Design an enzyme around this catalytic site. Structure first.
Site, PDB file in Angstrom:
ATOM      1  N   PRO A 157       0.813  -1.201   0.000  1.00  0.00           N
ATOM      2  CA  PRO A 157       0.000   0.000   0.000  1.00  0.00           C
ATOM      3  C   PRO A 157       0.858   1.268   0.000  1.00  0.00           C
ATOM      4  O   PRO A 157       1.980   1.235   0.497  1.00  0.00           O
ATOM      5  CB  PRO A 157      -0.742  -0.084   1.330  1.00  0.00           C
ATOM      6  CG  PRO A 157      -0.572  -1.442   1.874  1.00  0.00           C
ATOM      7  CD  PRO A 157       0.425  -2.149   1.044  1.00  0.00           C
ATOM      8  N   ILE A 158       0.320   2.349  -0.580  1.00  0.00           N
ATOM      9  CA  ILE A 158       1.065   3.616  -0.691  1.00  0.00           C
ATOM     10  C   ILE A 158       0.177   4.711  -0.116  1.00  0.00           C
ATOM     11  O   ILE A 158      -0.958   4.852  -0.545  1.00  0.00           O
ATOM     12  CB  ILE A 158       1.406   3.938  -2.157  1.00  0.00           C
ATOM     13  CG1 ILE A 158       2.372   2.895  -2.688  1.00  0.00           C
ATOM     14  CG2 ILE A 158       2.030   5.327  -2.268  1.00  0.00           C
ATOM     15  CD1 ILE A 158       2.565   2.910  -4.189  1.00  0.00           C
TER      16      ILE A 158
END
Lengths: 59, 59, 60, 58, 59, 58
Positions: free
Chosen positions: E1-2
């Protein structure tokens, strides 16, 4: 590096996989950065959700 | 198409110019989109402003 | 609603204030959303960090 | 200029077209930039994908 | 995830480091994702470049 | 503060609600900023739209 690429909808999964690979390689060689460090995320848009000069891309 | 590319600070002008050209070309051939329609924006980050696994990139 | 507006560096404080107000009003009336709910963030770019057709904006 | 506008889902295509036109015009007159140079992209969100104060918009 | 986190300028290095760690941990436990897979980027803004209700944050 | 969180598709509404709450609280305590000022927007991606090392996440 992290690249977000905004494109029109309608391409196949195969074309998008090509996009991801070719862009990732271009980033890696341009920056002399390890390929494993490059992240790409694709975001697709309907032409009714994109404007150029105030006019929908769909026209 | 629009690409936003997030990179660490410290790249040379030459590498950034190459990045813009090579990524734009990769997008254009991958999508069969006119090169003139491809826009790129580069955003630089300090390593103190980036996290990997909850830890600063600078460590 | 949240608008992120990416612009070339070099605009005045006054133009940026106008941008924020006029964009916020346009969003509010277009969507029938309360003006107070509209957020705008401006991000400036040097022309050396923007590409058009694979060429730097600072050249073309 | 490039504007990304994050909005809740549920508007008609016509309302979104109006949004794009009115925002583009506002950018153009605010910055004294040619209208033809202004690009807008809309991203819609479900209310379960938006938080205010830690609580869902829905 | 970012995660991309947009914050006002003026926080200390220590607070930003804490932000990165605590957000990364929150993402990891919420999604049952490995902590090592979580990336965070912080972007700072001057209050003159932020609008609320059409008014500058700086007023 | 505004956080945009990019995640893979496939989580439940409940997990996403938890994500929004826990991230918002982490931002608030890290920055000593009022919880009410924290906004979060989630964007989901198919694994075919994500690359690591040039290869699809899927």
């Amino acid at each position: 590096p992290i690249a977000q690429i905004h494109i029109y909808e309608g391409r196949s999964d195969e074309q998008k996989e090509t996009l991801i690979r070719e862009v990732s390689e271009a980033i890696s060689r341009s920056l002399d950065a390890p390929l494993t460090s490059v992240r790409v995320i694709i975001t697709e848009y309907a032409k009714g959700h994109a404007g150029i000069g105030g006019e929908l891309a769909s026209k």
